[PDB]
A and B are shown apart, each in its own frame.
Chain A
Amino acid sequence: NGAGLLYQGYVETSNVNVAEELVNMIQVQRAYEINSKAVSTTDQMLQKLTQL
């Protein structure tokens, strides 16, 4: 019924690959740093508008 097989004396490791994890970390760091810039710019615009 599609069930898998069993191997004696083996063990099933994790499916995580560090190589792609590191580049994904770079991507997410850059995206976060960019999104912070929108908050900074909105704050600056509000500050300029306040000083009228």
Chain B
Amino acid sequence: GKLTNGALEASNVDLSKELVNMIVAQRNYQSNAQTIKTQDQILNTLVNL
């Protein structure tokens, strides 16, 4: 396509989408940590008999 002199392209990012993705990623990371903790406890109860 045609070019345009005297102009520069933007960063093509959206702050709101990035913020909501950050929140969802944090929640998912904590949810996985909950599974890790559950596995830790379920093995600790078995090893201790």
List, in ascending order, chain B residues with CB within 8 A of A26's CB: 49
List, in ascending order, chain A residues with CB within 8 A of B47's CB: 22
Could you give, for residues 23-49 of chain B, a 1 whenever the CB lies within 8 Å of some chain A CB and a 0 otherwise? 000000000000000000001001101
A3 interface hit (Cβ, 8 Å): no
Chain B interface size, as a band, is under 10
Main secondary structure of the interface of A (DSSP, over half): helix
List, in ascending order, chain B residues with CB within 8 A of A18's CB: 43
Chain A interface size, as a band, is under 10
A46 interface hit (Cβ, 8 Å): no
Give chain A's interface residues, CB within 8 Å of chain B. Answer: 18-19, 22-23, 26
Give chain B's interface residues, CB within 8 Å of chain A. Answer: 43, 46-47, 49
7 contacts between A and B (CB under 8 A): A18-B43, A19-B43, A19-B46, A22-B46, A22-B47, A23-B46, A26-B49
